[PDB]
Amino acid sequence: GSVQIVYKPVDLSKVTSKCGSLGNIHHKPGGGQVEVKSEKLDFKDRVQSKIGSLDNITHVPGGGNKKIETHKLTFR
Amino acid sequence: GSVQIVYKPVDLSKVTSKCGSLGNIHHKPGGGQVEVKSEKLDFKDRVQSKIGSLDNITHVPGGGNKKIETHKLTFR
Amino acid sequence: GSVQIVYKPVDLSKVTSKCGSLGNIHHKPGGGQVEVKSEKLDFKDRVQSKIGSLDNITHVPGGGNKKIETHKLTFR
Amino acid sequence: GSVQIVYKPVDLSKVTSKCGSLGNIHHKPGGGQVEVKSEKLDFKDRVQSKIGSLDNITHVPGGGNKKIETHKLTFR
Amino acid sequence: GSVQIVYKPVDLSKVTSKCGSLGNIHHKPGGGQVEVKSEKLDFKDRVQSKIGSLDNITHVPGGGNKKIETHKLTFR
Amino acid sequence: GSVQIVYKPVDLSKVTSKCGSLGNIHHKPGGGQVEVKSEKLDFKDRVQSKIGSLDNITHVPGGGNKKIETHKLTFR
């Protein structure tokens, strides 16, 4: 029983961008407040907890062009 | 039982960017406050906890062009 | 039972960037405050805890172009 | 405004007993077992707790004649 | 405003007993076992706690005749 | 405003007992076992704690006749 696989993907894909000018970006929130309360925590597996974050983020890239791929060949 | 696999992906993909000027980026939040309260914690496996963060981030790259890939060939 | 694998990925992918000028980036938060309270902690495996961080980050790279890959061939 | 109280209770009450013979009293339980489990306890006032008793009592008095009273005169 | 109180209780009360013979009292339990488990305890006032007693009592009085009283006159 | 109190309780009360013979009192429990487990204790006022007693008591009085009283006159 001969088995033959030829996994040969091609890609020629350009992600481009042009922006004239980034500027005058203000970010001035008026504060904030968090409060959490509990008694016991029992974690057991691959838990990803977050309890009480107060983020403030200003993310100004001149690019930002993302390109994700994923290849998975499986055999049994 | 002959088995033959040819895993041969090609990629020619350019991620480009052009930005004229980055500037005048202010980031002036008015403070903040967090409060957490608990009694006991029992962790057991691959836990990723965070309890009470107060981040402030200003991330201004002139690029930021990300490109992620992943290849996984499996055989049994 | 002959088995033959040819894992031969090619890549010619350029990640480029052009930015005219980075400048005048202010980052002036108005302080902050954290408070955490607990009694006992029992950790058991590969725990990644963080309890009460107060980060302030200003990350201004002229590049920032990331490119991640991952190859994994497995055989049994 | 004259006020006059005359609190004058009388009592002539006899509590008697006659028993011919006390004897041959066996008390042979086959053991026992208790198990309690909790995390936190917060008590705050005039609490009367009991957690996990395993009493075995043999109380053989030749008398046992109890006589309780209570008098309370109150004025405002 | 004349006020007159005459608190004059009388008591002639006899508590008697007669028992011919106390004897042959066995008390042979087959053991026992207690187990308690907790994390934290916060007590705050007039608490009367008991945690895990294993009493065995044999109380054989030839009398046991109790007689309790209580008088309380109050004025304001 | 004349105030007159006459607190004059009388008592002629005899507590008697007669027992022919006390004897042959065995007390042979088959052992026992206690186990307590905790982390922290915070006591704050008039606490009466007991944690893990294993009493064995044999109380054989020929009398045991108790007689308790209590008088409390209060004025304001």
Curated annotation (Swiss-Prot), chains A, B, C, D, E, F:
The UniProt transmembrane annotation reads none
- Residues bearing Phosphoserine? 2, 21, 49, 53
Tissue distribution: Expressed in neurons. Isoform PNS-tau is expressed in the peripheral nervous system while the others are expressed in the central nervous system.
- N6,N6-dimethyllysine found at: 8
- Which cell locations does it reside in? Cytoplasm, Cytosol; Cell membrane; Cytoplasm, Cytoskeleton; Cell projection, Axon
Q: Where is this chain glycosylated? A: 44, 50, 66
Write down the position(s) of the site called Not glycated. 8, 14, 18, 28, 37, 40, 67, 72
State the function annotated in the UniProt record.
Promotes microtubule assembly and stability, and might be involved in the establishment and maintenance of neuronal polarity. The C-terminus binds axonal microtubules while the N-terminus binds neural plasma membrane components, suggesting that tau functions as a linker protein between both. Axonal polarity is predetermined by TAU/MAPT localization (in the neuronal cell) in the domain of the cell body defined by the centrosome. The short isoforms allow plasticity of the cytoskeleton whereas the longer isoforms may preferentially play a role in its stabilization.
Q: Which disease is it linked to?
A: In Alzheimer disease, the neuronal cytoskeleton in the brain is progressively disrupted and replaced by tangles of paired helical filaments (PHF) and straight filaments, mainly composed of hyperphosphorylated forms of TAU (PHF-TAU or AD P-TAU). O-GlcNAcylation is greatly reduced in Alzheimer disease brain cerebral cortex leading to an increase in TAU/MAPT phosphorylations.
Kindly provide the name given to this protein in its UniProt entry: Microtubule-associated protein tau
Task: Give the organism, scientific name.
Answer: Homo sapiens
From the UniProt record, report the name of the gene that encodes this protein.
Answer: MAPT
User: What stretch of the whole protein does this chain cover?
Assistant: 621 to 696 of 758
